[PDB]
Amino acid sequence: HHHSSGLVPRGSHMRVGFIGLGIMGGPMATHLLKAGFLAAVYNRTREKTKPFAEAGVYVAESPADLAKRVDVVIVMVSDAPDVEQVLFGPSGVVEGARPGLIVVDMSTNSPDWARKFAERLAQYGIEFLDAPVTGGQKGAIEGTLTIMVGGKEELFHRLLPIFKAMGRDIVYMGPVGYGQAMMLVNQVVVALNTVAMVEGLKLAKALGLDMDKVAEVLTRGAARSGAIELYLPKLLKGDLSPGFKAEHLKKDLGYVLEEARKRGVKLPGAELAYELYRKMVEDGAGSLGIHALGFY
Numbered sequence: 001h002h003h004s005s006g007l008v009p010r011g012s013h014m015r016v017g018f019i020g021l022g023i024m025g026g027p028m029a030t031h032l033l034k035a036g037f038l039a040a041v042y043n044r045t046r047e048k049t050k051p052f053a054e055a056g057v058y059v060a061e062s063p064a065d066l067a068k069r070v071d072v073v074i075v076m077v078s079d080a081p082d083v084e085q086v087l088f089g090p091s092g093v094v095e096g097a098r099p100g101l102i103v104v105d106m107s108t109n110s111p112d113w114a115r116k117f118a119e120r121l122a123q124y125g126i127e128f129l130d131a132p133v134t135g136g137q138k139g140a141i142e143g144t145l146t147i148m149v150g151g152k153e154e155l156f157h158r159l160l161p162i163f164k165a166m167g168r169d170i171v172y173m174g175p176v177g178y179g180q181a182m183m184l185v186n187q188v189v190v191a192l193n194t195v196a197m198v199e200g201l202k203l204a205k206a207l208g209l210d211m212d213k214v215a216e217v218l219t220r221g222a223a224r225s226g227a228i229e230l231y232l233p234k235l236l237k238g239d240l241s242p243g244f245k246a247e248h249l250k251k252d253l254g255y256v257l258e259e260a261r262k263r264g265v266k267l268p269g270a271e272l273a274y275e276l277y278r279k280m281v282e283d284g285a286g287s288l289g290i291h292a293l294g295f296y
């Protein structure tokens with residue numbers, strides 16, 4: 001069936017549907033709405049679609065109902081199995097998309113998963129990019145995300161206006177899976193920079209140092225990091241909320257270690273970080289921010 005007009009003209013070929021209105025997806029979709037690209041949203045939990053319905057965005061009943069109404073589907077759900085459900089489940093994107101739709105997975109998973117999604121979607125004549133992001137919840141809210149993209153270079157270029165609504169530095173990394181590969185590199189660094197912060201704070205509190213001065217010194221050379229700038233003021237206030245959930249970093253480190261074993265590289269720091277965050281999930285703190293490691 002054909003459908004009535006929505007917020008974004010059909011002739012633009014740039015109607016976006018957004019799936020996953022979480023800590024990152026809510027602000028990212030709001031940015032696409034401010035820029036005039038957002039036509040529709042889907043969220044598993046309906047209440048989070050409310051603020052978008054109040055601004056006239058269509059709230060779909062399923063990923064398939066969303067895909068039939070848009071040119072570009074952006075997915076920002078938790079993990080690879082979640083992406084599988086929203087693309088390939090009974091009422092997934094592939095059950096409503098027309099050939100020529102583009103799926104952009106902006107969640108974090110792995111190069112292998114990106115290539116699998118692309119291969120499966122190409123059976124339906126659906127295009128795919130992996131475009132994971134860094135900059136945290138603050139970057140999402142401010143629209144300043146760094147977005148790292150794998151797929152057809154032509155499609156990177158066609159979607160650049162959509163990526164610039166959500167982010168600032170938009171980097172084309174290479175073929176499918178190269179955005180996830182860059183993200184796995186990024187998440188090695190983020191995890192170990194976060195363990196750096198939490199161990200420095202544990203030592204500073206054991207030494208009885210003035211936290212005002214500890215924050216002053218650390219917020220500078222070359223101890224200073226993104227993880228300190230984004231999270232040390234929440235940590236010092238005892239605000240353990242995400243931020244970035246510990247269960248999601250555990251997931252990212254699992255993919256890092258799988259890729260390192262495939263390639264014959266030993267990453268003992270990433271292995272330790274995985275163990276630490278695995279324990280944090282087993283202890284029941286998987287939904288706290290990664291900065292609560294050591295303090296939960």
Ligand SMILES: NC(=O)c1ccc[n+]([C@@H]2O[C@H](COP(=O)([O-])OP(=O)(O)OC[C@H]3O[C@@H](n4cnc5c(N)ncnc54)[C@H](OP(=O)(O)O)[C@@H]3O)[C@@H](O)[C@H]2O)c1
Nearest residue numbers: 020021022023024044045077078082107108136137244248
């Ligand atoms: N937070 C950060 O700092 C950050 C930074 C960069 C990248 N990331 C990556 O971005 C992705 C999203 O992270 P987030 O922080 O936004 O997580 P989040 O706040 O936990 O939100 C996850 C979202 O995914 C939806 N979802 C999860 N499983 C699903 C399923 N099977 N079917 C349908 N929807 C499902 C959730 O729906 P409900 O609302 O129903 O729960 C929610 O909208 C993750 O891959 C994460 O690693 C996060």
